[PDB]
Design the sequence.
């Protein structure tokens, strides 16, 4: 019964109350995290504010040295961290060891990306002849206190993808780990503390969302909100932030537009590997298949073979399909499956449940009226939608409320490029599954998938402030 | 009795109701502008949404051609537009003609800068050996319908600085000209219509702010709100926009920090020219002087002479101090002046009201308890605040709720650079007054002066969406 | 008999000796240009060196104003300059006025692009913690005097492409027009002087190569040599320039790699349009077809139909095949054609020669021993080369000594991209012919095809010097 | 008595003959170096040509892993390499060890900088409406084989500054160590080979310039020459290169312009620290004090006491003034001192000579007639030159045939910026000594002082070719 604590002003501290964390696999007690109160969150913010000056008065290479030390420690304990993460959010054990390794690679790259940030030296001579002697030296300064709110699916990766870009840029970071996955956020904080990050530069906040979860967002000391989660909470954040800068990475129903000339075997393998990784619990996952009618049958057969080869089971057996995060999540996904079945959709895959453990349901004949065609299941369902033309596929893709990513499988790259130009998404992948990619590529969503563009350089550039210094050079 | 109309879907439209516009100089009826209803706003947004795809299907050079045409036409009617915008916001006629010519120059520069927006080609390898031979082609696409809300002080320049950067990027623009200054917004729309801009690409919205003011901000067709105005209204817009991208350019109490080793004559001339241009109704004006005690008396004397050389009167006489925009504005300035003089501030110039026409009040011995050290007047009042140290000056400057711009007057540029690093503003000017400047320069506020970075390149970038395309 | 004059120090200057220029189409006469002596070249160089300080002192928008005025005057006298151009180099009057118009467009774009050249404000904190208070403001200064040597092909376009990028960046320009199309260069100077560009900012130096050819290149006043022409002369310039910066745009042997999946009709049309534009006298024209065996016969038939549809005549009938520039050119192309004939290459189109007027020769079954497979003809002859594999095509394309551009005609863009990365050229066009393209695109050659990157942005950057100013900010 | 060998194709080689290398400190023999022949140089070039298309095919992060391994090994053996370097080139032991760790974190920065080189995605629609659908994907490809020639000055630092920016860019490198400092080049090769660098990727050439000196520069395998030496040999190289790209870092005569408002104590300290570091044997050292007559006497006294407190002796006692590299250098420097004192220059510090070890000479009343005012001594001689105005100082500064770096000591920064923009140098330091600076900063000479822009990013981009791939998106 481990009693994990909160990093606050460089000291590990606990709270009077604590939240118990149960495995989504078998409800094993993983430990407890403190249930902070509003005054505790307030004092963590005031520690951050006090640590900010000396942190941004450091040279970039020094902050990067701290970051590199953190990444080394994180890679050192990749199995300790990986096991706890694997039982905390019920993801495959190699998938959970893989997240820690990808995390360390991400913060190494962010440390090295954020010490190469170059300003501009602009002159007014090109705009007007009267300002020919004026020189603006434009650079970037930290926004201040960055508040990072991590999601459950990648509690170590999508938390470090906010902490490391903010830290190298000179900001202090306040981390809010998810409700499920908070022990992993505290373990990330342990790696940061072991590195030697100065007191107050990185603080953690754990608690009930009904007590401090709004209080930390509307706090006056917070200068930037970096949030990954679902679109409802993201829309609430966008209004609770006022006009303070935010980065929201919300839900996505990513389409796989498959056309007649698509190499269907590769398309099916990629579509299934994208759709069912972490049992569908990914924002950047293939969440619908929009296939043309002429190849829809063969694509459905290949998709069925791929989805039948998926091993459902328990995280430590390295199952492709592990239990979903909550019972409420399984109930919501089950409702989507029920609604599809009631409207005469062809479930060409066993449709059975075992509590949290759902089965990789591949549906066909999915129409506009089924909720599985629009709602993000965040679980193991994959709709197949048949369209008559490319225009119908593009209209179906752009009918979604989400614009995160999309895949276009073709053989004609000129055709794929103009479809990609037509798709109202942030990223289009040509003949590949949709993903966050190398975390040096831009990662952004549109209409409902969030605000701002991520990617390591884009995240460093987003939690900074432009400061122009203008003088005369005669 | 000119009945100005609204550009919607290329055609000119009027409404049943009408707002009447009176000069802040002598209250003459300048004309009337339509008071659109929420349904008419909706139709303007639908015209915009239908015009968007053919506008971004146009090549960049083809849209820049329209922008250059509009700038040439607008410079053609520099005197006609200038007189109307002079008597509409009580701006000096040589400054109102200058606003139009600088507007034309901004549209030219925006066209030619939005021609050259180049994307990236990232390679994946270098972050992972697995993602080697994945190529991301990163480019920018228009956000969609850009809603621009212009301020009264520059109805033509600060509406074009939202329209032209958005239009060149591929967006369609829905302009919301201010209440005082709506006629100049339609005079700017006249140029866009004359220069063959396609239907629905540029539309104008005029009406009472209690009928369509929130209806247009909250509309779902709006994809970007570009707003210039006051901090209360901007803070309201910030929440009303949701997670839609916004550009807010709110107020600012720009400080003029003067040190002991500083050319006081140059500093005084710059401080007064900045502070009292358009009689203080500028977001980027010197709105407070923070001088060190040793040079405070010499600077006060020099500042007083500079203020005394100011001409107060009528815009068409090219006065330095024309009347403020409204009576409520003058009452608010007069309240600040009263609060200051009822607290023993040394008024160094003759406090004198004549209706809207206020007088260039220069105050001294201003402390933190007077509400003129903190509140942005938007009128002809300059507080001198004396501090004992450079640290005291920086703390006083950073105590403001605004962070737009600031000036540091000294002779040690290394000292000025250090102070500029410490100042929580967007732009620091060393040994010059604050200004929006060369409009290619970044223009931004922090802390409460706004959200986002303006300046033409930054404006074009802000109203676009990154569109990555990854392949093998 | 029009006695054209050299623009020197704002004044029109003539010489004791004048070179006479005759029409390549009928040897008529067009006028004379001053054959300057070396002292005259010195006075032009000194005029430029004295004009340099006040031209640099100008604001960028003020320098751009002259450029825009020149562009307007050029677009005004489009038909006059065009007629003299089509007379000078036998180009085709609708393709000669097009050169004048594309030249004014280039000048406008160069002015507007040079307005926006922004510097860097680099900090040392990312590299070391001891330099964290040092700021480098890095901007670009003019090199000084730029010597632009134009070719006969495009004597106002490939001349403006050196003058305008140089002028907008603050340099003063020496223009050495081609010995043949010099009258067109003096017309360009007429336009620049009419715009009102200051005295000594743009001068022209005509003459005989044996007197002032190496003389102006070796002058110590010249700070940059921008030369486009033939590869041997380019090598001589590369030696003669010492360590002074140069930009050489030399010959090319651009290949059209045609694979089996290619759309052969599009390939044939693109290849013929690229290859026979201006009678093959372009460095960026297609100059050899490298085609796989399977589709080679169908491609050759399509290519033959395209070639035997080209108009051969005089420039004022707007012929696609107008006479080559001089008699030595026609003799060299005829020699290549003969060498191909004796080694049993299949002439797919008639082999005719009416003096300078050559007929377009499509040669099939061309092998590595015929010299038309390697040498740049600068004449209307295109060899088709058959290869058995994609690797054979890449080996044959990279066997050339030239590296300017190439086309890959394919249907698989992934394959086309792989081949493009394998081709040793500056630019690869996928399913299109080679061109200088939009002039904002980079234009460069590799191994034997030149030195430096052209394109308006790259040309502006090439003829400037980085000037870094480093100071403490704390 | 160690016999060092040449890294060729992953193997160590002696040739038949060996150049024996002696310590410039006394004469102590420290080893021999293979006197390679033209044939062996050819085999090394061919090994590099064969290793190229596997190093290119590697990922940027893998090539960077090799670079980081080399940097780690280099810091592991900093004292052994440093001691050998200090006796090899006669610099203080703490300064020879300090260019081994400065070299290692030059190598780290080079790798981290080279693995985020981004390309462009240019569209043609801004230039013309006919090319709106053309997209250029502009990326950078390795130049090929890089020839790096190091100077004796920094045989490790000024060698890695060419190797690492090359190797990270994907192109293989051949290193020619200086004749005096060959041991250090082979010691750096030892670290590169120990790191695991693939065979043929990093080779080393030693021998006699009369045998293999022009032979390697003129070799057709070489695609880029990166040379830092003296202006004569750089003039030869710029000619022998042809049109092959080169980077030349030649000599300098950096001036410290001191005006009347200047802080004279700071100027006096900075000037001596910059001028006499490594016995004045740096290209970027201060070699000229140009001071206004009002403050010239006070400056001269401060400078004299600054120079007098320097220590002259042995490198292992960490003398500030260690002996110059060879006897020819001491003869030339003594000739400069001679010419100065015959023409009635006022020696402010004693002039001495102990064969190779000279004493630092502060010369006042230096005029444009003494050779010490114009020639680069590469020895501990600093001439003070008095001028009557700032315009006279700028005229004297620009009178030099060198354009590398310059210092302006002022108190008015607007004045210092004015003068800096007037100065014909590559870098101007305001109120600080000239230096190569943080190596991320641009480093260049703009006169007969060099060709090309160095600095880690600038040298990475110099030894690459732009490759544009243009296709239609439509
Ligand atoms: O929330 C899930 C993320 O958006 C999915 O991206 P990732 O699995 O590549 O980190
Ligand atoms: O309303 C505020 C404007 O941004 C001020 O413009 P300006 O500083 O150029 O005079
Ligand atoms: O000399 C010939 C030029 O390089 C060919 O290019 P261009 O005809 O497209 O301008
Ligand atoms: O030019 C050479 C500089 O004097 C020293 O170079 P470095 O930065 O490698 O030590």
Sequence:
């Amino acid at each position: 019964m481990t009693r994990y604590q909160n990093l606050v002003n460089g000291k590990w501290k606990s709270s009077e109350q604590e939240i118990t964390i149960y495995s989504p696999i078998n409800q094993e007690e993983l430990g407890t995290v403190p249930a902070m109160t509003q005054t505790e969150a307030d004092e963590a913010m005031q520690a951050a504010r006090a640590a900010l000056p000396a942190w941004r008065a450091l040279s970039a290479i020094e902050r990067a040295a701290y970051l590199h030390k953190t990444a080394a420690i994180l890679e050192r304990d990749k199995e300790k961290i990986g096991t706890i993460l694997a039982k905390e959010v019920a993801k495959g054990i190699k998938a959970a060891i893989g997240e820690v390794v990808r995390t360390a690679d991400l913060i190494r790259y962010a440390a090295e990306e954020g010490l190469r940030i170059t300003g501009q030296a602009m002159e007014g001579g090109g705009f007007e002849a009267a300002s020919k002697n004026k020189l603006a030296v434009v650079r970037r300064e930290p926004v201040g206190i960055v508040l990072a709110i991590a999601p459950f699916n990648y509690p170590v990766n999508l938390s470090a993808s906010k902490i490391a870009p903010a830290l190298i840029a000179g900001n202090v970071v306040m981390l809010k780990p998810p409700t499920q996955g908070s022990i992993s956020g505290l373990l990330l904080a342990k790696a940061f503390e072991e590195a030697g990050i100065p007191a107050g530069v990185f603080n953690t906040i754990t608690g009930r969302g009904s007590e401090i979860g709004d209080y930390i967002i509307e706090h006056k000391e917070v200068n930037f909100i970096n949030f990954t989660g679902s679109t409802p909470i993201g829309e609430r954040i966008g209004r609770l932030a006022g006009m303070r800068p935010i980065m929201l990475e919300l839900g996505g129903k990513d389409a796989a537009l498959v056309l007649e000339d698509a190499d269907l075997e590769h398309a099916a393998k990629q579509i299934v590997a994208g759709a069912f990784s972490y049992s569908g619990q990914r924002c950047t996952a293939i969440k619908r298949v929009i296939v043309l009618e002429s190849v829809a049958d063969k694509l459905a057969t290949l998709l069925q073979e791929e989805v039948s080869k998926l091993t459902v089971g328990d995280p430590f057996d390295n199952a492709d399909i592990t239990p979903v995060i909550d019972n409420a999540s399984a109930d919501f996904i089950w409702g989507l499956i029920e609604d599809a079945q009631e409207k005469e959709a062809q479930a060409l895959t066993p449709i059975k449940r075992e509590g949290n453990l759902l089965w990789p349901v591949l549906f066909d004949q999915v129409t506009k009226d089924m909720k599985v065609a629009w709602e993000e299941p965040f679980g193991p369902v994959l709709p197949i939608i048949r369209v008559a033309s490319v225009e119908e596929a593009i209209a179906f893709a752009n009918e979604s409320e989400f614009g995160l990513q999309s895949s276009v499988f073709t053989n004609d790259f000129k055709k794929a490029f103009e479809i990609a130009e037509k798709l109202e998404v942030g990223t289009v992948h040509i003949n590949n599954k949709t993903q966050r990619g190398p975390d040096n590529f831009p990662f952004l969503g549109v209409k409902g998938s969030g605000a701002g563009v991520q990617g390591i350089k884009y995240s460093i550039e987003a939690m900074t402030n432009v400061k122009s210094i203008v003088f005369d050079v005669k």
Notes: The CA atoms of residues 440 and 456 of chain D lie 5 Å apart. The domain at 254-430 of chain D is CATH 3.40.309.10 (Aldehyde Dehydrogenase; Chain A, domain 2).
